[PDB]
């Protein structure tokens, strides 16, 4: 029974942590994607302002 416990832990644990630690990547993607679009859109808008 504590065997089947360890397989269940490993399976659900592995799947969930894979999803969350990938969401870490989409998160840092959001971080520096916001940082880049900040100045990018900034220069389009300040070029269309004049």
């Amino acid at each position: 029974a504590m065997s089947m416990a360890v397989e269940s832990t490993g399976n659900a644990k592995a799947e969930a942590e894979s999803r969350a630690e990938a969401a870490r990547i989409e998160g840092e993607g959001s971080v520096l994607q916001a940082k880049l679009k900040a100045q990018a859109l900034a220069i389009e808008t300040e070029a269309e302002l004049e």
Binding site: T45, E46, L49
Partner: protein, 51 residues
């Protein structure tokens, strides 16, 4: 962005709406003076008598 597009909008909006009121002033000055020349040489009592 939402500050500096929308504030240059405020400043141009001023430059245009003191403008429309300036248009209104000048056209209404001409309407004014040319009703004045109208009535004063038509006659102060003539307008009363005709009505």
């Amino acid at each position: 962005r939402v500050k500096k597009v929308r504030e240059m909008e405020l400043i141009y909006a001023r430059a245009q709406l003191e403008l429309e009121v300036s248009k209104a002033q000048q056209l209404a000055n001409v309407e004014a003076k040319k009703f004045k020349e109208m009535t004063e040489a038509l006659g102060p009592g003539t307008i009363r008598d005709l009505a």
